Amino acid sequence: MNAPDRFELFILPDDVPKLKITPDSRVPNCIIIKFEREDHTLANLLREELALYPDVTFVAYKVEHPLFANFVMRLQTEEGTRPKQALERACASIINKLKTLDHKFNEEWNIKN
């Protein structure tokens, strides 16, 4: 009866940004990013994809409570890399792989019919 909305899982509020960055000044070259309105489905995909790269050193996320559709992530790469750039390249590579995936799947369903 205090039951909230279940479009709190994907729709952002008005003056809240979708992507809220705060750089963590404990160690150099690390950042904390307050993602709005998601779950694991973004996060794990970003985790393992940020994992295998060389220049990335530390990357870790947590979902503070699963009855709230938010999560927060930590991102420290090496010295040289602005890590935001690395994550943008990470998105580029993921969409590259998946668009290749859709492409060959279309071809394979064309053959299998």
Partner 1 sequence: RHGQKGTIGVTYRHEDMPFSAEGIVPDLIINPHAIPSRMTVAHLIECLLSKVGSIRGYEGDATPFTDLTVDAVSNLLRDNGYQSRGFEVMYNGHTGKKLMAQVFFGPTYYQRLRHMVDDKIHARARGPVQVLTRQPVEGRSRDGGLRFGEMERDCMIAHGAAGFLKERLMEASDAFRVHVCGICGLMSVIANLKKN
Partner 2 sequence: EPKVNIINAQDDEVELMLSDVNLSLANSLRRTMLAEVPTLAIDLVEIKMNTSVLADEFISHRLGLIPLVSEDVEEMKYSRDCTCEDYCDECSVVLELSARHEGEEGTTDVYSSSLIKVSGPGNLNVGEPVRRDDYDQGILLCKLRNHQELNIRCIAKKGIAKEHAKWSPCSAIAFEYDPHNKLKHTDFWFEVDAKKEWPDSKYATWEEPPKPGEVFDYKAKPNRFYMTVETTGSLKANQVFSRGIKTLQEKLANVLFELENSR
Partner 3 sequence: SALFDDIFTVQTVDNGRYNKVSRIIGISTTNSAIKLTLDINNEMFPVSQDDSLTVTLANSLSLKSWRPPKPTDKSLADDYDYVMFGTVYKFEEGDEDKIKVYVSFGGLLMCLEGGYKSLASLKQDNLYILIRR
As measured in angstroms, the least distance from the Cβ of 79 to partner 3 is: 10
Please say whether the beta carbons of 83 and 76 come within 8 A.
yes
CA distance 81 to 96: 22
Among 19, 52, 67, 111, interactor with partner 1 by CB under 8 A: 67
Q: Which of residues 24-63 bind partner 1 (CB under 8 A)?
A: 39-41, 44
Please name every residue paired with 76 in a beta bridge, in sequence order, or none if there are none.
30, 58
What angle is formed at CA 88 by the lines to CA 37 and CA 96, rounded to 5 degrees? Answer: 100
Using CB under 8 A as the binding rule, whether residue 54 contacts partner 3 is answered as yes
Contact mark string toward partner 2, 76..105, x via CB under 8 A: --------x--xx--xx-xx-xxxxxx-xx
CA distance 113 to 104: 14
- Which of 1, 19 has the CB closer to partner 1? 1
Query: Contact positions toward partner 1, by CB under 8 A?
Result: 1, 39-41, 44, 66-67
